Amino acid sequence: MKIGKTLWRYALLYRKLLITAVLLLTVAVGAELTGPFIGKKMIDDHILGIEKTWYEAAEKDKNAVQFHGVSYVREDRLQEPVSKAKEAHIYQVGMAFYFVDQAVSFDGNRTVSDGKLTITNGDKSRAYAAEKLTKQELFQFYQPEIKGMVLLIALYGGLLVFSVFFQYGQHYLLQMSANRIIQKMRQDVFSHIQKMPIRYFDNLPAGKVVARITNDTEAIRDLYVTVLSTFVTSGIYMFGIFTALFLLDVKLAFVALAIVPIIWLWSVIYRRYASYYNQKIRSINSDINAKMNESIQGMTIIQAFRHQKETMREFEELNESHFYFQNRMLNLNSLMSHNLVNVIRNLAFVALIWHFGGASLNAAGIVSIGVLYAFVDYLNRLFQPITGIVNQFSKLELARVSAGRVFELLEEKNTEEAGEPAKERALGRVEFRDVSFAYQEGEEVLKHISFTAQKGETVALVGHTGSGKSSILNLLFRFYDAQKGDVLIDGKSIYNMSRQELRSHMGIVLQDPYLFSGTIGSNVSLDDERMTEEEIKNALRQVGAEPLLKKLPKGINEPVIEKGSTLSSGERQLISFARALAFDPAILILDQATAHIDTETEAVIQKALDVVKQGRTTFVIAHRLSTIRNADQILVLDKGEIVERGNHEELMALEGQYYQMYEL
Amino acid sequence: FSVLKKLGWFFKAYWLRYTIAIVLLLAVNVIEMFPPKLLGNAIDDMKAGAFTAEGLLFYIGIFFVLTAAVYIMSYFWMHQLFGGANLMEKILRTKLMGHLLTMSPPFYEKNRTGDLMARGTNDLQAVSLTTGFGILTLVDSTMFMMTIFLTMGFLISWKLTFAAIIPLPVMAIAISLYGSKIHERFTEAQNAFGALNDRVLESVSGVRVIRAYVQETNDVRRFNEMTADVYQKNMKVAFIDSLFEPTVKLLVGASYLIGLGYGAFLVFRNELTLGELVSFNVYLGMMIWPMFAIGELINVMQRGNASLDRVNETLSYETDVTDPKQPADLKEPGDIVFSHVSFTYPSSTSDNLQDISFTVRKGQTVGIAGKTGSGKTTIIKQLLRQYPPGEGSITFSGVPIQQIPLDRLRGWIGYVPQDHLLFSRTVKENILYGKQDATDKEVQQAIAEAHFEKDLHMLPSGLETMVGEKLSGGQKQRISIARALMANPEILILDQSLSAVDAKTEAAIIKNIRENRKGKTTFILTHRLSAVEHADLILVMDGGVIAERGTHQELLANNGWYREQYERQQL
Ligand SMILES: CCOc1ccc(-c2nc3ccc(-c4nc5ccc(N6CCN(C)CC6)cc5[nH]4)cc3[nH]2)cc1
Ligand SMILES: Nc1ncnc2c1ncn2[C@@H]1O[C@H](COP(=O)(O)OP(=O)(O)OP(=O)(O)O)[C@@H](O)[C@H]1O
Ligand SMILES: Nc1ncnc2c1ncn2[C@@H]1O[C@H](COP(=O)(O)OP(=O)(O)OP(=O)(O)O)[C@@H](O)[C@H]1O
Ligand SMILES: [Mg+2]
Which among B220, B277, B433 has the least Cβ separation from residue A305? B433
Cα–Cα dist B510/B516, whole Å: 10
The atom number, within ligand 2, closest to the CA of A511 reads 26
Phi, psi of A440 (to 5 degrees): -85, -65
Nearest residue on chain B to A107, alpha-carbon basis: B49
From B488's Cα to the closest Cα of chain A, the distance in A is 12
**Are A319 and B197 an interchain contact pair (Cβ–Cβ within 8 Å)?**
no
Tell me, using a 6 A CB cutoff, whether residue A384 lines ligand 1: yes
- On whether both B364 and B487 belong to a single domain, the answer is yes
Three-state secondary structure call for residue A63: coil
Laid out side by side, the sheet with A126-129 consists of: A109-112, A116-120, A126-129
Expressed in angstroms and rounded, the spacing between residue A438 Cα and the centre of ligand 2 is 11
Of B262, B260, B196, the C-alpha closest to B228 is B196
Q: Is B374 annotated as a binding residue?
A: yes
Listed residues B293, B328, B363: the one ending a domain: B328
* Chain A residues inside the 8 Å CB shell of B55: 357
Which among B49, B98, B264 has the least Cβ separation from residue A312? B98
Domain span including residue B469:
329-570
Cα–Cα dist B171/B71, whole Å: 29
What's the total number of domains in chain B?
Answer: 2
Cβ-contact A121, A108 below 8 angstroms: yes
Of B541, B175, B195, the C-alpha closest to B352 is B541
From A167's Cα to the closest Cα of chain B, the distance in A is 6
Of B29, B111, B102, B93, the C-alpha closest to B66 is B29
Cα–Cα dist A105/B92, whole Å: 77
Cα–Cα dist B357/B325, whole Å: 24
**Strand-pair partners of A117:** A112, A128
Expressed in angstroms and rounded, the spacing between residue A471 Cα and the centre of ligand 2 is 6
Nearest CA to ligand 1 atom 21: B179
Expressed in angstroms and rounded, the spacing between residue A508 Cα and the centre of ligand 4 is 13
Cα–Cα dist B283/B218, whole Å: 61
- On whether both B440 and B465 belong to a single domain, the answer is yes
* Chain A residues inside the 8 Å CB shell of B223: 187, 190
Three-state secondary structure call for residue A243: helix
From B417's Cα to the closest Cα of chain A, the distance in A is 9
Cα–Cα dist A409/A405, whole Å: 6
Q: What's the CA angle centered on A562, arms A559 and A568, to 5 degrees?
A: 70
Cα–Cα dist B182/B256, whole Å: 28
Query: Could you say which DSSP state residue B320 is in?
Result: -
- On whether both B49 and B157 belong to a single domain, the answer is yes
Listed residues B282, B301, B328: the one ending a domain: B328
* Chain B residues inside the 8 Å CB shell of A306: 407, 410-411, 436
Cα–Cα dist B406/B414, whole Å: 14
- On whether both B290 and B336 belong to a single domain, the answer is no
Resolution (A): 3.1
Of B178, B80, B200, the C-alpha closest to B135 is B80
Nearest residue on chain A to B60, alpha-carbon basis: A350
Question: What are the CA-CA distances from residue B357 to residues A496, B335, B377, B525, B546 (Å)?
Answer: 73, 13, 16, 17, 9
- On whether both B335 and B192 belong to a single domain, the answer is no
Which of A384, A386, A392, A395 to mutate to test ligand 1, by most ligand atoms within 8 A of the CB atom? A384
Expressed in angstroms and rounded, the spacing between residue B378 Cα and the centre of ligand 2 is 38
- Length in residues, chain B: 571
Q: What is the DSSP string of B160-212?
A: HHHHTTTHHHHHHHHHHHHHHHHHHHHHHHHHHHHHHHHHHHHHHHTHHHHHH
Residues with CB under 6 A from ligand 3: B 345, 347-348, 352, 370, 372-378, 418, 495-496, 525
Per-residue HEC secondary structure of B84-139 comes to HHHHHHHHHHHHHHHHHHCCCHHHHHHCCHHHHHHHHHHHHHHHHHHHHHHHHHHH
Tell me, using a 6 A CB cutoff, whether residue B288 lines ligand 1: yes
Cβ-contact B221, B148 below 8 angstroms: no
* Chain A residues inside the 8 Å CB shell of B101: 295, 299, 302-303, 308, 311-312
From A77's Cα to the closest Cα of chain B, the distance in A is 19
**Are A508 and B570 an interchain contact pair (Cβ–Cβ within 8 Å)?**
no
Query: Could you say which DSSP state residue A633 is in?
Result: B
The alpha carbon of A306 is separated from its chain's Cα centroid by a whole number of angstroms, namely 46
Cα–Cα dist A512/A497, whole Å: 28
Tell me, using a 6 A CB cutoff, whether residue A622 lines ligand 2: no
Cα–Cα dist B267/B279, whole Å: 14
Expressed in angstroms and rounded, the spacing between residue B351 Cα and the centre of ligand 4 is 42
Cβ-contact B184, B240 below 8 angstroms: no
Laid out side by side, the sheet with A634-638 consists of: A462-463, A634-638, A641-646
User: Residue A117: which H helix or E strand, with range?
Assistant: strand A116-120
Burial A372-391 (b: 16+ CB within 10 A, else e): bbbbbbbbbbbbebbbebbb
Q: Is A465 annotated as a binding residue?
A: yes
Cα–Cα dist A435/A384, whole Å: 70
Which among B48, B116, B267 has the least Cβ separation from residue A94? B48
Cα–Cα dist B134/A431, whole Å: 74
Q: Is B373 annotated as a binding residue?
A: yes
Burial of A95 by CB count in 10 Å (0-12 exposed, 13-18 middle, 19+ buried)? exposed
**Nearest ligand to the C-alpha atom of residue A468:** 2
* Chain A residues inside the 8 Å CB shell of B210: 526
User: Residue A74: which H helix or E strand, with range?
Assistant: strand A71-74
Tell me, using a 6 A CB cutoff, whether residue B180 lines ligand 1: no
Three-state secondary structure call for residue A120: strand
**Are A93 and B117 an interchain contact pair (Cβ–Cβ within 8 Å)?**
no
The alpha carbon of A91 is separated from its chain's Cα centroid by a whole number of angstroms, namely 62
Q: What's the CA angle centered on B347, arms B343 and B353, to 5 degrees?
A: 20
Laid out side by side, the sheet with A452-453 consists of: A452-453, A430-433, A486-489, A492-493
User: Residue B367: which H helix or E strand, with range?
Assistant: strand B365-370
Laid out side by side, the sheet with B399-400 consists of: B337-338, B394-396, B399-400
Listed residues B328, B353, B379: the one ending a domain: B328
* Chain A residues inside the 8 Å CB shell of B198: 517
**Nearest ligand to the C-alpha atom of residue B168:** 1
Tell me, using a 6 A CB cutoff, whether residue A164 lines ligand 1: no
**Strand-pair partners of B413:** B491
Cα–Cα dist A580/A608, whole Å: 11
**Are A297 and B113 an interchain contact pair (Cβ–Cβ within 8 Å)?**
yes
Nearest CA to ligand 2 atom 21: A466
Handedness of CA B55, B57, B63, B68 (dihedral sign): negative
* Chain B residues inside the 8 Å CB shell of A297: 113
Tell me, using a 6 A CB cutoff, whether residue B248 lines ligand 1: yes
- On whether both B530 and B495 belong to a single domain, the answer is yes
Of B170, B188, B287, the C-alpha closest to B230 is B188
Q: Is B131 annotated as a binding residue?
A: no
Q: B53-101 and A308-335 are packed helices; what angle lies between their axes, rounded to 10 degrees?
A: 170
Of B276, B253, B272, the C-alpha closest to B36 is B276
β-strand B365-370 against B537-542: which pairing, if any?
parallel
Cα–Cα dist B517/A559, whole Å: 54
CB under 8 Å to A434, separation ≥6 — which residues? Answer: A448, A449, A450, A484, A485
Question: What are the CA-CA distances from residue A403 to residues A4, A256, A534 (Å)?
Answer: 9, 36, 45
**Nearest ligand to the C-alpha atom of residue B416:** 3
Query: Could you say which DSSP state residue A232 is in?
Result: I
**Are B245 and A327 an interchain contact pair (Cβ–Cβ within 8 Å)?**
no
Cβ-contact B299, B137 below 8 angstroms: no
Cα–Cα dist A164/A159, whole Å: 8
- On whether both B144 and B218 belong to a single domain, the answer is yes
Handedness of CA B148, B154, B157, B163 (dihedral sign): positive
- On whether both B474 and B516 belong to a single domain, the answer is yes
- On whether both B260 and B368 belong to a single domain, the answer is no
- On whether both B322 and B338 belong to a single domain, the answer is no
Q: Is A467 annotated as a binding residue?
A: yes
From A366's Cα to the closest Cα of chain B, the distance in A is 11
Expressed in angstroms and rounded, the spacing between residue B374 Cα and the centre of ligand 3 is 7
CB under 8 Å to A456, separation ≥6 — which residues? Answer: A617, A632, A633
- On whether both B55 and B178 belong to a single domain, the answer is yes
Q: A369-383 and B274-285 are packed helices; what angle lies between their axes, rounded to 10 degrees?
A: 10
Q: Is B253 annotated as a binding residue?
A: no
Q: What is the DSSP string of B428-497?
A: HHHHHTTTTSS-SHHHHHHHHHTT-HHHHSSS--TTT-B-S----HHHHHHHHHHHHHHT--SEEEEEST
Burial of A630 by CB count in 10 Å (0-12 exposed, 13-18 middle, 19+ buried)? exposed
**Strand-pair partners of B447:** none
Q: Is A94 annotated as a binding residue?
A: no
Phi, psi of B524 (to 5 degrees): -120, 125
- On whether both B200 and B301 belong to a single domain, the answer is yes
